[PDB]
Amino acid sequence: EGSIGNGLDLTGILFGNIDSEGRLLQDDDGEGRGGTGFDAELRENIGSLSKLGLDSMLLEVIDLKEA
Amino acid sequence: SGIVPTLQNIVATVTLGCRLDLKTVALHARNAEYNPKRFAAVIMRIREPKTTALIFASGKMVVTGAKSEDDSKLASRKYARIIQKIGFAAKFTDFKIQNIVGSCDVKFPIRLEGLAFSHGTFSSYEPELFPGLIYRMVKPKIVLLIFVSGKIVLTGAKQREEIYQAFEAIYPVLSEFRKM
Numbered sequence: 491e492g493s494i495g496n497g498l499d500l501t502g503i504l505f506g507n508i509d510s511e512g513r514l515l516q517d518d519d520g521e522g523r524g525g526t527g528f529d530a531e532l533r534e535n536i537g538s539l540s541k542l543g544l545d546s547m548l549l550e551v552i553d554l555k556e557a
Numbered sequence: 558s559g560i561v562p563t564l565q566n567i568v569a570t571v572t573l574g575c576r577l578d579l580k581t582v583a584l585h586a587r588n589a590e591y592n593p594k595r596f597a598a599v600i601m602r603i604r605e606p607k608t609t610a611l612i613f614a615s616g617k618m619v620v621t622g623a624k625s626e627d628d629s630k631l632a633s634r635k636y637a638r639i640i641q642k643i644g645f646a647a648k649f650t651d652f653k654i655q656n657i658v659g660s661c662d663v664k665f666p667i668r669l670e671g672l673a674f675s676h677g678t679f680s681s682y683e684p685e686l687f688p689g690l691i692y693r694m695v696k697p698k699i700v701l702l703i704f705v706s707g708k709i710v711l712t713g714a715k716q717r718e719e720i721y722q723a724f725e726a727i728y729p730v731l732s733e734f735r736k737m
């Protein structure tokens with residue numbers, strides 16, 4: 491009666507401030523169609539970047555497995 | 558030679574030294590989110606500096622969104638305060654940047670399949686999901702994203718020297734397998 495693999499998806503947390511929910515953000519804001527920040531090629535990939543290496547930096551920012 | 562990686566953000570962990578009630582912490586926090594479907598912790602967020610953080614019931618919390626040391630040092634104090642401002646006894650210690658984010662352009666495109674064919678024992682490339690490349694620098698240990706566009710990212714470093722080195726280590730690997 492439990493889950494397999496405790497911890498949250500912080501693949502984006504280390505990629506640039508994100509909401510543990512998986513929302514990546516940027517300390518600054520941009521209202522242009524292309525400027526400082528990554529386009530939509532990483533954000534949609536981060537949600538799945540936890541299958542090549544980020545897995546290590548994934549649980550390395552949310553050790554939520556000791557409560 | 559002459560690019561240097563630019564810092565884009567940083568991530569550090571902090572500990573209040575006291576346990577808290579996520580249910581009340583998110584209910585008493587003016588800006589916090591608690592999703593039981595993602596994990597067992599709350600998520601605070603402030604616009605000064607504009608960063609985000611997630612505290613655990615064990616008091617241990619992680620803050621991200623800062624662009625340097627002083628940038629994160631202030632963001633953390635604010636979060637730790639939200640708890641003490643709510644009535645809890647959270648403290649402010651154990652602060653440390655364990656991940657720094659940087660980025661830069663080599664001015665030229667790189668062969669994603671070329672780097673994965675030379676460092677297959679360290680570089681990764683999935684044309685079925687990730688069109689970019691992920692190099693896991695051995696020392697220091699960091700991940701670098703390189704796209705044919707020439708954009709190079711560096712996250713996972715533990716000190717400004719790490720980000721500046723990770724690039725100085727893969728800088729040549731890319732120039733050796735450039736695309737142009």
